[PDB]
Design an enzyme around this catalytic site. Structure first.
Site, PDB file in Angstrom:
ATOM      1  N   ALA A 108       0.768  -1.232   0.000  1.00  0.00           N
ATOM      2  CA  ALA A 108       0.000   0.000   0.000  1.00  0.00           C
ATOM      3  C   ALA A 108       0.806   1.293   0.000  1.00  0.00           C
ATOM      4  O   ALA A 108       0.224   2.363  -0.172  1.00  0.00           O
ATOM      5  CB  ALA A 108      -0.953  -0.003   1.199  1.00  0.00           C
ATOM      6  N   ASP A 115       2.356  -2.314   4.412  1.00  0.00           N
ATOM      7  CA  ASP A 115       3.633  -2.249   3.709  1.00  0.00           C
ATOM      8  C   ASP A 115       4.711  -2.120   4.761  1.00  0.00           C
ATOM      9  O   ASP A 115       4.419  -1.827   5.930  1.00  0.00           O
ATOM     10  CB  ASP A 115       3.707  -1.128   2.674  1.00  0.00           C
ATOM     11  CG  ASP A 115       4.432  -1.564   1.390  1.00  0.00           C
ATOM     12  OD1 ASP A 115       5.098  -2.639   1.366  1.00  0.00           O
ATOM     13  OD2 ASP A 115       4.301  -0.842   0.379  1.00  0.00           O
ATOM     14  N   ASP A 171      -4.991  -5.191 -19.220  1.00  0.00           N
ATOM     15  CA  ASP A 171      -5.021  -5.529 -20.653  1.00  0.00           C
ATOM     16  C   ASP A 171      -6.437  -5.322 -21.203  1.00  0.00           C
ATOM     17  O   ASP A 171      -6.619  -4.981 -22.381  1.00  0.00           O
ATOM     18  CB  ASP A 171      -4.561  -6.982 -20.877  1.00  0.00           C
ATOM     19  CG  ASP A 171      -3.115  -7.235 -20.402  1.00  0.00           C
ATOM     20  OD1 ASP A 171      -2.275  -6.300 -20.456  1.00  0.00           O
ATOM     21  OD2 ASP A 171      -2.815  -8.383 -19.982  1.00  0.00           O
ATOM     22  N   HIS A 225      -0.185 -12.114 -19.130  1.00  0.00           N
ATOM     23  CA  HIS A 225      -0.200 -10.670 -18.869  1.00  0.00           C
ATOM     24  C   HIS A 225       1.042  -9.960 -19.396  1.00  0.00           C
ATOM     25  O   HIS A 225       1.377  -8.873 -18.925  1.00  0.00           O
ATOM     26  CB  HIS A 225      -0.307 -10.510 -17.347  1.00  0.00           C
ATOM     27  CG  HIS A 225      -0.525  -9.110 -16.864  1.00  0.00           C
ATOM     28  ND1 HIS A 225      -1.529  -8.298 -17.349  1.00  0.00           N
ATOM     29  CD2 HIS A 225       0.037  -8.436 -15.828  1.00  0.00           C
ATOM     30  CE1 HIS A 225      -1.524  -7.156 -16.680  1.00  0.00           C
ATOM     31  NE2 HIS A 225      -0.587  -7.217 -15.748  1.00  0.00           N
TER      32      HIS A 225
END
Lengths: 316, 317
Positions: free
Chosen positions: A13, A39, A155, A182
């Site tokens: 985060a 984090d 995407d 991806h």
């Protein structure tokens, strides 16, 4: 436990993507939903305080330090966006170089604390980082194929955006299926399945190539210094939103990277019906054009090798 | 001329590369009405790429980014100009000011030439002062319009809505809290007495008012010297921009904002303002105040007037 007040955890985060995602989640998640931001950086508590000043009924709390456990407890959805995003010097190489360890470290914590959560791997390279997550989960004895997703949604945003512009369609109501992986030639938007578009053979190859290389348009426009941070956060928030809806009983279908029937590759992105257990049913890719058919066969070795890279990182 | 009338609404963000700016461009791409043009500018060369980033989000909002020393292309035809450029840890308030005051002046000089009839929302701090600065720069070019210059105080409002809703069990997305005065410290005055469905014990007023006034510092400390509020600030700005776009589009809205009004308390003062096609349509009265609010208002003016004076002096003398 799970399934009362929905609980969403964001691991990573404090980064560019993470902070943007935290913001979107605060504004988009259903009322009552618990948002835990984690984090290592000490700024993370402050990111949560910053987001908590926005008047929505989403309860946000901050966590920092070495142990993400307090943030993962009772989590229904876990979004992993930690590590680095592509930049000037970084090729396929540097992302794996740094993010492989980070992903493993976090998935080990998830396997212990909230093994029944739906896990969304945003951290790149997705084709590989998802296999890392799977192997870690299998070592801990809690791997559930229905709950591990490679977030390929960016995407889709890109395909919807470029297709709508080029063919004069409603940008917010144009569905474009994207399958495979991806990254690079593994990203295959199924242009032939888009409604209200008549395609000259001329425009198929350039549009596909633009979708596949979209990250480079940002990387070059950003004069190097920066990647697709903001669109990645929106792609992640959209996927998170679909997950929460599936878990809440509302049927939604999203193209996402999951461990399917292995017809083309162990892990593969395709349309998935989301539900109460995460994946409810992995849907077929549907009819493909000659072009699309060939693009699929041509990506297989690259895709399989991306997976084997993640498997070998954990299994040696 | 009874039929159809188009609208090519344009919003420009000056300072789109910073923490606030990038989050703001994201929100504007998502929240602005279909067909609105969004222009992003900042001296930082990354800006064009910030725009390419948000342009991949599927909404009918066209976005373009610009860098270099010339914001002209970004301001051409702009209806709304949001200024979040400059700097926010480890710096004295007088140390920043000299940097930011200059950047605001430079940007307003271009606004006056390229899009003088645009509504200008100043986000860059200290807002009490930067607004006076913009007003004087616009006046030098003979284009200062009181109805089109605003100090964005919306974040004090979001904070007020959030703290009040959570403390008194009200609906957080349906709790209105007027905030008057200025945008900094003692000048931020939330009118808690005008909040419906909240019964206040006298002892809850002071600490809650101080929580709202000191919210910036709490984020500053909580970030461990890693920055000031950026995410909630972008959303405050997005909400204010959305209100300006509504008013211009013929949709009546009311927002507490820092403008040059009747001058009853100070040249620039934040209060309820009905927005319209020319920016300010009418500056509404603050309404009745409690004894505490009346005192807070009186004790605050000298500081507010001095913040304004400083911004005028920076340009005139």
């Amino acid at each position: 436990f799970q399934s009362n007040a929905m609980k969403v955890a964001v691991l990573g985060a404090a980064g560019g993507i993470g902070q943007a995602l935290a913001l979107l989640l605060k504004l988009q998640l259903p009322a009552g939903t618990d948002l835990s931001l984690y984090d290592i950086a000490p700024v993370t508590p402050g990111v949560a305080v910053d987001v908590s000043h926005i008047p929505t009924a989403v309860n946000v709390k901050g966590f920092s330090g070495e142990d993400p456990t307090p943030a993962l407890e009772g989590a229904d959805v876990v979004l992993i966006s930690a590590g680095v995003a592509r930049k000037p010097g970084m090729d396929r190489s540097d992302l794996f170089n740094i993010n492989a360890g980070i992903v493993r470290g976090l998935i080990e914590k998830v396997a212990v604390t909230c093994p029944k959560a739906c896990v969304g791997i945003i951290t790149n390279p997705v084709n590989t980082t998802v296999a890392i997550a799977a192997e870690v989960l299998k070592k801990a004895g809690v791997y559930d194929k229905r709950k591990l997703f490679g977030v390929t949604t960016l995407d889709v945003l890109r395909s919807e955006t470029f297709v709508a512009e080029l063919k004069g369609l409603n940008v917010s109501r144009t569905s474009v299926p994207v399958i495979g992986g991806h990254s690079g030639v593994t990203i295959l938007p199924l242009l032939s399945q888009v409604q209200y578009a008549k395609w000259n053979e001329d425009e198929i190859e350039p549009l596909t190539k633009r979708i596949q290389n979209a990250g480079t348009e940002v990387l070059n426009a950003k004069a190097g210094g920066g990647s697709a941070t903001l669109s990645m956060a929106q792609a992640a928030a959209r996927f998170a939103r679909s997950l929460v809806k599936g878990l809440s009983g509302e049927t939604v279908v999203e193209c996402t990277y999951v461990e399917g029937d292995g017809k083309y590759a162990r892990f593969f992105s395709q349309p998935v019906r989301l539900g109460k257990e995460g994946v409810e049913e992995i849907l077929p890719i549907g009819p493909l054009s000659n072009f699309e058919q060939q693009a699929l066969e041509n990506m297989l070795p690259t895709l399989r090798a991306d997976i084997e890279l993640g498997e070998k990182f954990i299994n040696g």
